[PDB]
Amino acid sequence: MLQFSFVSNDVVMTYDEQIIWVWESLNKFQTVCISRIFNFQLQDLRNPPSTVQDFNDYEYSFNFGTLNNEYITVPGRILSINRDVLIHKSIKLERKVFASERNVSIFGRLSKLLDHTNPIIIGGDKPEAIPKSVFQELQSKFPNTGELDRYANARVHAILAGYLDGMKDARERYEHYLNRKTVIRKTDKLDLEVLNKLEIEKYTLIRDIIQDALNNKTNLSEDDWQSLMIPFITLLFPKYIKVLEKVKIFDYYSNPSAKTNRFIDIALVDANGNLDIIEVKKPFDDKILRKTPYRDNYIPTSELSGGIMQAEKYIFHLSKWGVKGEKELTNAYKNSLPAGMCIRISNPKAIIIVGRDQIANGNMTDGQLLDFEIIKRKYANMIDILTYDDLLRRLNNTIEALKG
Amino acid sequence: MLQFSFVSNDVVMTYDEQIIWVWESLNKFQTVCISRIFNFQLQDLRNPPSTVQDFNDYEYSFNFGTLNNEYITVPGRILSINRDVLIHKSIKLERKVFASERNVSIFGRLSKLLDHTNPIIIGGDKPEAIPKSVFQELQSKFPNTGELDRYANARVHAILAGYLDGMKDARERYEHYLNRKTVIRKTDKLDLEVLNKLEIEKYTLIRDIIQDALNNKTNLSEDDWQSLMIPFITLLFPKYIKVLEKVKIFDYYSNPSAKTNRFIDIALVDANGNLDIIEVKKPFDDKILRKTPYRDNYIPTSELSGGIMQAEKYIFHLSKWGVKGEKELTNAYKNSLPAGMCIRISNPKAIIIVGRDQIANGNMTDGQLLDFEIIKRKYANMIDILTYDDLLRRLNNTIEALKG
Amino acid sequence: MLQFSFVSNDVVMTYDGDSGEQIIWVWESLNKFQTVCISRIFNFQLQDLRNPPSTVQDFNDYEYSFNFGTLNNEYITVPGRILSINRDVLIHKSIKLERKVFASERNVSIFGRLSKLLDHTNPIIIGGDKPEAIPKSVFQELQSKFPNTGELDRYANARVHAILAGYLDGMKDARERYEHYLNRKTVIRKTDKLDLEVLNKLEIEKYTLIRDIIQDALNNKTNLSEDDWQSLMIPFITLLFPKYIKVLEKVKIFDYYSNPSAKTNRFIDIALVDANGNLDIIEVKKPFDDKILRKTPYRDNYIPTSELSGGIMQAEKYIFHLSKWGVKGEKELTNAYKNSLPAGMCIRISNPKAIIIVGRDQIANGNMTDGQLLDFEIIKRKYANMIDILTYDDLLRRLNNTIEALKG
Amino acid sequence: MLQFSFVSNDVVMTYDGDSGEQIIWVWESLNKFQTVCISRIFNFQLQDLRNPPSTVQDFNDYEYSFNFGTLNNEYITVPGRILSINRDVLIHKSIKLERKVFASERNVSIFGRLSKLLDHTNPIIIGGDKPEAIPKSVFQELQSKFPNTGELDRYANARVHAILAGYLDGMKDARERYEHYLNRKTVIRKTDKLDLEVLNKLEIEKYTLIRDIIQDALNNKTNLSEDDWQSLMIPFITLLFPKYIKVLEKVKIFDYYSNPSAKTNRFIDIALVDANGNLDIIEVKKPFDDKILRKTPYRDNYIPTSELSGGIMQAEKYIFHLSKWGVKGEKELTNAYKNSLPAGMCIRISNPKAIIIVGRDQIANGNMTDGQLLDFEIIKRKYANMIDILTYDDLLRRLNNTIEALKG
DNA sequence: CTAGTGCATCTGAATCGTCATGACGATTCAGATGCACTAG
DNA sequence: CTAGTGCATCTGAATCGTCATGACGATTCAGATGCACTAG
């Protein structure tokens, strides 16, 4: 068990499997590795052990780097990475801080992910520092050997279920809907109560399919998740009439010399003919807010702000593309539309479904719910910013409204 | 190290130190696991290991399966599965055939997915056999070392977002590679045609009642016209889940000395709980445009402009009510709403269904058709200004879309 | 002398002619042409005369009796042949029958001019509870503000005075106000170094100059055309709204909707450029009418006037054609107006909005009620693409508020 | 009929009148009043009559000959008492003597309004070789510009169109026809327009002083804290944004959403009041080198940073609590800030918006790609309740564009 | 004696047709680069 | 783990065809400007 301590300014860890073989490797290569992550040198060793004394009584004293400005500074040659790493005194110096399960280096992937040579700072009051609870979240959800075996087992299960009965979970729910359909529809005459029971069964089917996709189909492609969500967009939002995929729009602002082609992934036409955009994003992470507030205000994530800005680029290119774009989109999609209706670009807006919010089971302050409600109406060209749990809550509220 | 070879009908595994540890573990628990995926027994040794013979010089031999009709018959105890595995002789026997990256079981997950007790045949001319060329397609879809590296970079990028501004774009690199491998065959999509005829039968039932109301029920009163449309409002606009009638609104502006009670005739509640207004008016012949233009522009008529101002006064007195009106409207309407939902006044907007456009029989010009679309979008707090002919036009566009 | 009386169903009136005038003329003209015109407006055939005059009876004691109209459903239905018009005239019983209903000063027919304006056949209904009826207060405003011989002579005198004033001395009152501004500026700027207190006093002098020039144009320059009125208001539009950097006139827009086959040219009269280069428009309308709300409310709500709604609809055509024009509009308006702009700056159409200055609202008289003020602010904030809706009195009130805020 | 015939040096006019009219009233008015108003435009004494009428002779056979003046040096000199003015009127011989020269359509006096508009004592000279003379083509353009019968008919139809616009749907567009007719008769000239060059130099000095103070604060006041950076930028907020007339500091607003059980006080740092009374928020922040863009794209899209999103979220707190505060907030803010505001002004919370000045863009230093500026301007126009997001370098760019526009 | 209507005449603007030109988008093709999969 | 290598991708000339805009020339219709008669 590696034991960490600090003596005055310097930080001297104690290490205690043959100790004599570690000394022979340190004399042989001039470098030694402790637990396949902590690389060390003879200069990092504070004092050499003598061969006369017992090596088992002696504990190995290695320098972990100097402590400066209230920061345990660990250099890059110890962790075999590019930049240094700074740890605050509030994070206890421990083997599990620098290592994941089955000897996976935590900061090696972080150093491979950062282009800038500026150091990684954990904790404290630095402006570029990572907070403490974000670091425990990174330690809990690191892609270690247990996570990467779980991802590979879930993907191979997802590939093999796609080859045999790819939509068997939605087919069972649709067969349950068809069994509930003939029970409700006893007579061929349609009234308002039987219609309300059929809307209850339809919204229950859509809610159960979306919940079963959230439980089991999260380890899919973005195109596969979108192809899961296409046949229910016009039922969740019955204003819109047609779902259009890979809609080629014209961009003139990113390259001023020549027109660039851009592609809206999912686009929506309502009954008047106006074109709108929906962004159905795959729920990779379970947050809609950053887990620490900036200045006691919770800010949106990079995943939320990426989808808003992509939809705003689509809205910008449609509004700049104008009546030439109206004629081009009504020439591209005249056969798919009902007859007599043309595609119009008249102030297009966007719908964003991103990823989960953890409103349920608690774990949210009134300020967090206030920031989430303010953020869902913050933007100009978004008529709806939804999470997947907001979609399930809207479906549930529509179910108990149609019941009563 | 595993070598795949076959002599006569038998198939021989060779494993190349730790050879003694495999034979010692076979004596303890009467089962071993070699390369994490293959299970062998004491019967499974083609020749037994010898203690006087050196285990480094000794080479393991394991009768993997029998060769009958060019099929290698693997028992299920080796792969720890209930079902048998048969592989054609055209498929080369390899560790990559049985195992993907991170040592997941290819026939382990496949056995769990399968429901039939027929065994798994790979290759050959059998009708129950998996084809060889689609087994290489399944093996190419399985995650290699580049996918698990891209998933590990994207998972850290999902956690540390908004804290490290200099990280590489790993979420874009992961999802662009994952779109190349799609698990959905797309010919197994859910056929929702039985739901779509019920949406046709719902929208035709709304369209036939309203068109019968425009021809015969015009002799009824204004409140008798509103009563007829109230059960179809939440079906026509499924964003709104609750219809509220005679909603008392406090007025502080028409009389500055004392509060005045004002009444919204029909009010609408969203699934989130936001409060909106619908103004259902009696249809007459020309209720949108005046007969003569003003300064070559067709202006709204006095019947329409009084209808917008009646809704805009309701929006003004709701917005000026503030947080004291959200507590008042929730307390008056908690039993009508679903549980856990409060009425919130967060930018209320109005829907007006007024008059008949008479676009066809009237044969209005392109100048009049230009002015007709501008009036519906000329008001900040009106999301939808409709005629009853436009409501029938939007209902007909739903029916033609759901048909094809 | 004409007097109106109600016997039975049919409305009668008696022509009491002058003693010097021979009453026989009405009867000999009815014998000759079968029509007679008394008081130059009212026309009567022989079937309208109830009693033909006896030749033995002296005419001066006799009074003629004419079927002026029929009273039915509390409405006096005057035929159009009486007023020499094509449509009927329906007068409510609350409006008493006199010559002043059908005449302005020096025998000007009200319903003749009104009938000429109407292209259809449908009758004119005055007063009462019909939905097509002109109200009684609106009819009294029509009688008070009719273009009679007094109004047309006053309009011609004001027009001739405006034209002669344009020819000689041009704009003199604005030059005198600018000379007063220059004198106050020379009093205030005693130091070449510019200070924030001196800047506030110079902003006070500039805003009093703009307020007095707009007030003098409202007092004396109402009878000019909109080209002349917009030429009066354009050098102070940038100073009134200093977000806007350049005033552009006769901006050629392309309209692809009014005709789907071919592109139509449209022209914005005044268009404004921001400092970013965004292009918004302004509608400066000449104040022909003294009101901006309708005089009677429609079902307890005060609806806007046709002048205001026409200005909003014209600005919405301009905003719609600029938004539909797209990036080709930005390239065309950049190439058309490159030399007018500052260097390195281009026209961009990114959600264009409009400012409307239409005409007066009579708030400062105090005749408006609380609901009329409430409906006035709701109309001012009602529309989507209009950032500012102004009257001229709202412009003067906002200028006075900036002056009193800068004074402290 | 009026005929102007000259006999040697003097010029007479024959007054025919009408056959139905009796022109004995001319000699009767000359007998008692000693003046007669001929054709409502001319005045004549008893000495102006050439031949006195005889009672033995028939009046209708006699034609009244009044002298109009004396012709000398090819100039018809008309006395001022003839046209009822102070000064004389000189008409050249080349201009035909007619009633239309002296009168317009509605019997207005052209030389009457001309002598009313002329400041000096000197007589009106029309035509000829004199430089003081009004030229013949200029006077004929003035006579063509005067209102004829088609102008008054269109004005009358436009006036009763303006009275009855909301009550009669079927009236023809008379306002469009009258204002389109008036646009071809312009009054003002472009040479007479007001030269506001001296006023525009003061605006150049104002925006130059503000730009130099802001740029010197960017170069050397980086060390200054955030609150005193706000205190530096407060006296220029009204000048940069002249829509807002009052700057309010530490505005206590009431919050009911963060704590349902009890009300918490929230404090807007700087708040702005319109000239109408609408309340807005300005968020003046400390400038930094990279606080707009996050400098690495997320899905090939540059996302806003944590600092800018925190500023937007704080302004959205202030806008949300002002909107949820309602009418009680308007009475509370009016009661709290009655003495700071001008008289007659109340604070109204009617859709409040925010302006955020955040930090330097770093465009020319960064040399960013056109996609990066595209992501940047989409960030500036992304949010609903922010009317105008800007940087400090963007503020300097708008100031430089305003200065270069006011230069020319 | 002003209000009101009818008419002949000149004129300017909306329109249609045609012709010319230039810009712009679709298609091709190739050279080169970035990516990603696999073997020593 | 790292280098070789094949493939998908982006990007720049480069041609071509079509469309959209502008300008000219005839045309006709509605507008506008006077005369002109008319009513006790």
Same domain as B378, residue B346:
yes
Question: Within 10 Å of residue A374's Cβ, how many Cβ atoms?
Answer: 20
Strand D64-72 and strand D42-45: the pairing is unpaired
Q: Where are the alpha helices (DSSP H) in B121-217?
A: 132-141, 145-159, 170-178, 193-215
Residue B302's Cβ-count burial label (10 Å; 0-12, 13-18, 19+) is buried
Q: How many domains does chain D have?
A: 3
Q: What is the DSSP letter of A232?
A: G
Nucleotide with C1' nearest the C325 CA: F20
**B15 sits within 7 Å of strand E by its CB:** no
Which residues does residue A244 pair with via DSSP β-bridges, in sequence order? A267
Rounded Cα distance between B264 and B278, Å, is: 9
Same domain as B226, residue B277:
yes
Q: Specify whether the CB–CB gap between B349 and B383 falls below 8 A.
A: yes
A-chain CB neighbours of C325 within 8 Å are: 322-323
CB contact under 8 A, C118 and D168: yes
**D269 sits within 7 Å of strand F by its CB:** no
D-chain CB neighbours of A385 within 8 Å are: none
- Residues of C from 71 to 90 whose C-beta is within 7 A of strand E: which are they? 84
Distances (CA, A) of D370 to A88, A170, C188, D366, D375: 41, 45, 48, 12, 9
CB-based contacts of C38, cutoff 8 Å, min separation 6: C15, C17, C26, C44
Strand A260-270 and strand A275-280: the pairing is antiparallel
Sign of the Cα torsion A158, A163, A164, A167 reads positive
User: What phi-psi label fits residue B88: left (phi over 0), alpha (psi between -120 and 50 degrees) or beta?
Assistant: beta
Sign of the Cα torsion C200, C206, C210, C216 reads positive
Closest CA to D218 of D285, D283, D269, D272: D285
The secondary structure of B312-335 as a DSSP string is: HHHHHHHHTTTHHHHHHHHHHSTT
Interface test with A, best of B144, B155, B208, B270 (most A CBs within 10 A): B155
What phi, psi does C199 have (nearest 5°)? Answer: -65, -35
User: Looking at chain C, which residue has its C-alpha nearest residue D208?
Assistant: C194
Evaluate whether residue B236 is within a structural domain: yes
Burial A23-51 (b: 16+ CB within 10 A, else e): beebeeeeebebeebbbbeeebbeeebee
Interface test with A, best of D298, D375, D377 (most A CBs within 10 A): D298
Same domain as A398, residue A304:
yes
Distance F17 C1' – C259 CA (angstroms): 26
Evaluate whether residue B341 is within a structural domain: yes
Give Cα B118 to chain centroid, integer Å. 35
Same domain as B315, residue B243:
yes
Question: For residue C356, what are the domain limits?
Answer: 226-407
Closest CA to C274 of C328, C347, C338: C347
Same domain as B228, residue B310:
yes
Nucleotides of F under 7 A from a protein CB: 12, 20-22, 31-35, 39-40
Nucleotide with C1' nearest the D182 CA: F32
Closest CA to B357 of B270, B303, B306, B285: B285
Burial B376-392 (b: 16+ CB within 10 A, else e): bbbbebbebbbbbbbbb
Rounded Cα distance between D102 and B69, Å, is: 127
Same domain as C256, residue C126:
no
CB contact under 8 A, B313 and C384: no
What is the token pair recorded at D157?
């139809």
C-chain CB neighbours of A324 within 8 Å are: 326, 328
Closest CA to C125 of C85, C86, C77, C69: C77
What 3-state DSSP class applies to C393?
helix
Nearest residue to nucleotide F32 when comparing alpha carbons to its C1'?
A: D150
Residue type, A97: V
Q: Specify whether the CB–CB gap between B204 and B399 falls below 8 A.
A: yes
User: What phi-psi label fits residue C54: left (phi over 0), alpha (psi between -120 and 50 degrees) or beta?
Assistant: beta
Same domain as D50, residue D166:
no
Instruction: Tell me what percent of chain D is helix, strand and coil, each rounded to the nearest 5.
Output: 40, 20, 40
Rounded to the nearest 5 degrees, what angle is found at the Cα of C306, between the Cα atoms of C263 and C138? 155
Residue bearing tokens 């209230």: A70
Residues 336-395 of D with CB under 8 A from A: 370-371, 374-375, 378-379, 381-385
Method: cryo-EM
Q: Where are the alpha helices (DSSP H) in C281-408?
A: 306-325, 327-336, 370-380, 392-407
Rounded Cα distance between C60 and C18, Å, is: 9
- Residues of C from 234 to 293 whose C-beta is within 7 A of strand E: which are they? 262, 264
User: Looking at chain B, which residue has its C-alpha nearest residue A138?
Assistant: B159
Sign of the Cα torsion B77, B78, B80, B85 reads negative
Same domain as A118, residue A246:
no
Which residues does residue D386 pair with via DSSP β-bridges, in sequence order? D354
Evaluate whether residue A217 is within a structural domain: no
Question: Within 10 Å of residue D14's Cβ, how many Cβ atoms?
Answer: 14
Evaluate whether residue A196 is within a structural domain: no
CB contact under 8 A, B158 and A402: no
Sign of the Cα torsion B35, B38, B42, B44 reads negative
Evaluate whether residue B112 is within a structural domain: yes
D-chain CB neighbours of B325 within 8 Å are: 326
Closest CA to D309 of A305, B171, A129: A305
Residue bearing tokens 């009041």: D273
Distance from CA of C383 to the nearest CA of A (A): 15
CB-based contacts of B225, cutoff 8 Å, min separation 6: B213, B217, B280, B281, B282
Same domain as B223, residue B103:
no
Evaluate whether residue D187 is within a structural domain: no
Instruction: Tell me what percent of chain A is helix, strand and coil, each rounded to the nearest 5.
Output: 40, 20, 40
End-to-end, the C-alpha distance of chain D in Å comes to: 58
Which residues does residue C109 pair with via DSSP β-bridges, in sequence order? C103
Residue type, C170: G
Closest CA to B305 of B266, B267, B354: B354
C-chain CB neighbours of D345 within 8 Å are: 401
Query: A118 touching D, CB under 8 A?
Result: no
Alpha-carbon dihedral angle through residues C200, C353, D197, C203, given to the nearest 10 degrees: -10
Same domain as B229, residue B170:
no
Interface test with A, best of C256, C258, C266, C324 (most A CBs within 10 A): C324
Report the residue from A256, A366, A371 with minimal CB separation from D313. A371
Rounded Cα distance between A293 and A365, Å, is: 12
Q: Where are the alpha helices (DSSP H) in A333-382?
A: 366-376
Domain finish residue from A84, A111, A142: A142
D-chain CB neighbours of B292 within 8 Å are: 169-173
Rounded Cα distance between A128 and B164, Å, is: 7
What phi, psi does B158 have (nearest 5°)? Answer: -75, -30
* Residues belonging to chain B: 404
Rounded Cα distance between D311 and D358, Å, is: 8
* Residues belonging to chain C: 408
Nucleotides of E under 7 A from a protein CB: 1-5, 15-16, 24-26, 35-38
What is the token pair recorded at D263?
């009300």
Same domain as D343, residue D207:
yes
Task: Provide the number of CB pairs (under 8 Å) joining chain C to chain D.
Answer: 212
Report the residue from C256, C257, C326 with minimal CB separation from A321. C326
Evaluate whether residue A243 is within a structural domain: yes
What is the token pair recorded at A234?
């016009």
Evaluate whether residue C283 is within a structural domain: yes
What 3-state DSSP class applies to D326?
coil
Domain finish residue from A142, A165, A182: A142
Rounded to the nearest 5 degrees, what angle is found at the Cα of D114, between the Cα atoms of D111 and D116? 110
Same domain as C117, residue C17:
yes
Q: Specify whether the CB–CB gap between C355 and C241 falls below 8 A.
A: yes
Question: Within 10 Å of residue A354's Cβ, how many Cβ atoms?
Answer: 27
Closest CA to D114 of D103, D105, D128: D103
What phi, psi does C314 have (nearest 5°)? Answer: -70, -40
The secondary structure of A348-364 as a DSSP string is: --EEEE------TTS--
